[PDB]
Design a protein around this ligand. Sequence first.
Ligand SMILES: Nc1ncnc2c1ncn2[C@@H]1O[C@H](COP(=O)(O)OP(=O)(O)NP(=O)(O)O)[C@@H](O)[C@H]1O
Ligand SMILES: Nc1ncnc2c1ncn2[C@@H]1O[C@H](COP(=O)(O)OP(=O)(O)NP(=O)(O)O)[C@@H](O)[C@H]1O
Ligand SMILES: CC(C)c1ncc(CC(=O)N2CCN(c3ccc(C#N)nn3)CC2)cc1F
Ligand SMILES: CC(C)c1ncc(CC(=O)N2CCN(c3ccc(C#N)nn3)CC2)cc1F
Ligand SMILES: [Mg+2]
Ligand SMILES: [Mg+2]
Lengths: 352, 352
Amino acid sequence: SPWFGMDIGGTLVKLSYFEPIDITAEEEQEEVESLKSIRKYLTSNVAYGSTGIRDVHLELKDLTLFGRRGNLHFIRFPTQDLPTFIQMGRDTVLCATGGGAYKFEKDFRTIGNLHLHKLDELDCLVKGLLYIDSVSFNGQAECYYFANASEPERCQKMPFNLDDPYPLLVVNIGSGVSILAVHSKDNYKRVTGTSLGGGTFLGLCSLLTGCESFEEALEMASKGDSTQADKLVRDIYGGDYERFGLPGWAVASSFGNMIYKEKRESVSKEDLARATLVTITNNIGSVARMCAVNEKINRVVFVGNFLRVNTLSMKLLAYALDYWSKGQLKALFLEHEGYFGAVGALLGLPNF
Amino acid sequence: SPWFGMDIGGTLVKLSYFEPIDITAEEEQEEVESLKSIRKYLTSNVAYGSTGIRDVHLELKDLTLFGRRGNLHFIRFPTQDLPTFIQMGRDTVLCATGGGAYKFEKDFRTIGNLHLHKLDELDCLVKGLLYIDSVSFNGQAECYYFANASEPERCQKMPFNLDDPYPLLVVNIGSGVSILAVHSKDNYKRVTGTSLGGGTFLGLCSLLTGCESFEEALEMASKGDSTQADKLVRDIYGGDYERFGLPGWAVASSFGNMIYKEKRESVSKEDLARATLVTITNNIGSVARMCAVNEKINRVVFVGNFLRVNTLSMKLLAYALDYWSKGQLKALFLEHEGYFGAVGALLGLPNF
Ligand SMILES: Nc1ncnc2c1ncn2[C@@H]1O[C@H](COP(=O)(O)OP(=O)(O)NP(=O)(O)O)[C@@H](O)[C@H]1O
Ligand SMILES: Nc1ncnc2c1ncn2[C@@H]1O[C@H](COP(=O)(O)OP(=O)(O)NP(=O)(O)O)[C@@H](O)[C@H]1O
Ligand SMILES: CC(C)c1ncc(CC(=O)N2CCN(c3ccc(C#N)nn3)CC2)cc1F
Ligand SMILES: CC(C)c1ncc(CC(=O)N2CCN(c3ccc(C#N)nn3)CC2)cc1F
Ligand SMILES: [Mg+2]
Ligand SMILES: [Mg+2]
């Protein structure tokens, strides 16, 4: 049986696959052709069909897991294409998490004799996050922050040590947002969540600009000026609101300048994309700040695929969390940020 | 000099005007024609030009203020039309608050010999709120809540006593959102704020539906189904997410079903209006809940004109705050909710 961990989210399926690299001469003969075809298919291709992708840069090489050495691979595809995945399987013990482990349980059982083991998505997230940081990213730090995030000429990605990770606030930005407080390896809770997450960015962006992919939405946003759509403090006060330390550049009302018809007629799609990104990102940061204050936790780590290839939102979070907390909170990021649930699911294999 | 209080916000100007009703025979002769023309103009019209409105239902009758008896009137017009207001004035001590008291200071001083006194918008809000509740709404309660907000066959507006109003969390929903913690008549602070407020509702609604007024946006929303645009917990899990008590009907991702092109092509403008309203309203409620928990305050009063003629958002707030706090927080509302800053400004007149 191949060793796989699957996190079926509302938008993306994430798959962690352990490729053994210590296969003995006797073991290669004993392996069945279907198993060899799967291993070869997965390791000789980086694109799978039309929508599956192997994130080769994230591979952990020569990892020791369950007493074997191998490479840990990280693979993603849209949940909309899970029927293709299952149909290919019909042409193994599967540890699965995410909402889709429940929603699609009956579909996975169409694969004869397959044993599906549903695992909790936040249990798997915490276990996978702690594990990956513990083994390191091929000797490099898994965790990083942006040093001097308020000064663009200095701002730079820097490694951050999580050897004693507790306590930790984890902000999981998927379709929506889950906020977790982790006090130990066995003591964690879901503090709250928000509905304004990555699916809001992508959904609103598509409605407003006609973009047809997450990457196109980010490309548009990179070219836009959110202040063409947003109403700033200085638009209301003429400058800073000094009594409460609100700088003129702060957003007072997201999309608030779109109440004027002439401004709706002049705004560009790129401006709207950037305002959508800024609106969602600042709200996530603000909710994270309030939760960190209430939980008395000063390290805030952001995960989920809203931040994949999204340096704009990462840098906005780093700057905003530091600025609005007056330096009391630190924004942290993880190289394997979308895959922790899939890894945590894989890690449950020995229990079955 | 007529007694006026003005709150110049980012979107609306609010004006409180005290009409004396104890004018003696000698006083009517001494009054100048311009003053008599202003009082007559204000009290014989309910529409002023094309965009000014007197909210006659809010009038406080036979109020004793500064040692005189009179009627307190409540008048609003768009900040975009303030040049018309100022030009009419050029054809008095003015206590003014809101950002526009600063932004338009030089414009108010084009009225010869006018004395402008800028007052802080959250100082005025707290003072006006406490004052109006203290004098009552013509003998009725100024404050109300929705009893049994979780059961539509029972849910009904009911009066609420604020005779000892402290402590109180005040959520001011204007263009954006300000959240205040009031501990006494002289001890209050701005806890935080959000950029996702009434201008976000109106701005996004206009972009998405082509509506041309706040009232039209609400009319559209009243006919729509937000679940056509939003991705719910049951869309991801197939039902409830039981481990964390998330019901299937909860929104997991606002506008999250709009990542699918075929759903964008089927959604109605009314659906989009309702999803915008629900998205903004739930986020305001959630931020209010987190702030109330951190401030250790269990009464949350919502003000600002986002809720004017907006029973949908008021009932959503009442239900959501009670549901998501497991009954620990109570949503409160005020009949004069958009006008407290203007009243607090008027109340500063004796200091000058
Ligand atoms: N290739 C992509 N396709 C779609 N969305 C993408 C893609 N890449 C990045 N994203 C973003 O990543 C978000 C989904 O993140 P992800 O952590 O995989 O959520 P999920 O697990 O599928 N949803 P959930 O059930 O709420 O946990 C989307 O909402 C987008 O904002
Ligand atoms: N006639 C109207 N015109 C515009 N907006 C309206 C109207 N009626 C209700 N609204 C809503 O009321 C909101 C403005 O509320 P209001 O409390 O008057 O804010 P403001 O004081 O002008 N803004 P701010 O400077 O942020 O405090 C708008 O964003 C709309 O959502
Ligand atoms: C008084 C009126 C005109 C008014 N209404 C609303 C606002 C918005 C506001 O108050 N804020 C503060 C909190 N903020 C963030 C952002 C990111 C993070 C992170 N990470 N944290 N906080 C968002 C904007 C301003 C304002 F002047
Ligand atoms: C696990 C994944 C699939 C997921 N991701 C996000 C959510 C959203 C969420 O967690 N919530 C709770 C807080 N909530 C409100 C709303 C109003 C108030 C008031 N007043 N308070 N809270 C909003 C929705 C669900 C969810 F299953
Ligand atoms: Mg997920
Ligand atoms: Mg205001």
